[PDB]
Design a protein around this ligand. Structure first.
Ligand SMILES: O=C1N2C=C(c3ccc(O)cc3)N=C(Cc3ccccc3)C2=N[C@@]1(Cc1ccc(O)cc1)OO
Length: 190
């Protein structure tokens, strides 16, 4: 039973996103742009994961939608406070879709990442594949933290992760500060 109640004023939820913001703020001037974010997704991440042009584009579209959901746009610098209020709007919009049994932006982003890793048609992500993602995206480079993610989640009998489980975890991790989601990224993200 995922937590659907928001906790936007919680110091821990704020710090989780402040951590992500600072992680995306390259030169550390206290601001980020959609340009820099999409570049990371397409020129860096997708390239190293050897995604096809179509997979790269699908992934790009998902990222653009996720961050535009935070009020971000190309050519505009965003400061943390504004980024955070934007994230609160994305979160409520996502929870509304969840309440309507409509696919969320984080679920669709997940589908795009999972497809890039869908080779033998496993339709899932293995520990090694996630380890690669953690390193290439930079969100969780430590092998230990990636192993912590898999120990944290409910895996199938083969030890692989499925998109519904990751979506479920992410909804609680990014949006509602679900106690069940705490620890999702080991020490990689608070
Ligand atoms: O969830 C994810 N992320 C959340 C945030 C993020 C950023 C700012 C916030 O305030 C909060 C969260 N940043 C990145 C990393 C990234 C950023 C920009 C472009 C590409 C990648 C990121 N990568 C994901 C991708 C993913 C999505 C669904 C899945 O099922 C599996 C994997 O795996 O962690």
């Amino acid at each position: 039973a995922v937590k659907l109640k928001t906790d936007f004023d919680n110091p821990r939820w704020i710090k989780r996103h402040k951590h992500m913001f600072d992680f995306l703020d390259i030169n550390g001037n206290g601001k980020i742009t959609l340009d820099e974010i999409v570049s990371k997704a397409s020129d860096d991440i997708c390239a190293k994961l050897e995604a096809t042009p179509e997979q790269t584009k699908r992934h790009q579209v998902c990222v653009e939608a996720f961050f535009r959901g935070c009020g971000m746009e190309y050519g505009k610098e965003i400061a943390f406070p504004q980024f955070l209020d934007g994230f609160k709007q994305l979160a409520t919009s996502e929870l509304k879709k969840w309440a309507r049994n409509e696919p969320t932006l984080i679920r669709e982003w997940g589908d795009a990442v999972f497809d890039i890793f869908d080779k033998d048609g496993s339709g899932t992500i293995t520990l090694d594949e996630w380890k690669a993602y953690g390193k290439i995206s930079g969100i969780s480079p430590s092998q230990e933290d990636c192993e912590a993610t898999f120990r944290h989640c409910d895996l199938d009998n083969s030890g692989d992760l499925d998109v519904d489980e990751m979506t479920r975890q992410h909804l609680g991790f990014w949006y509602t500060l679900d106690p069940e989601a705490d620890g999702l990224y080991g020490n990689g993200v608070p």
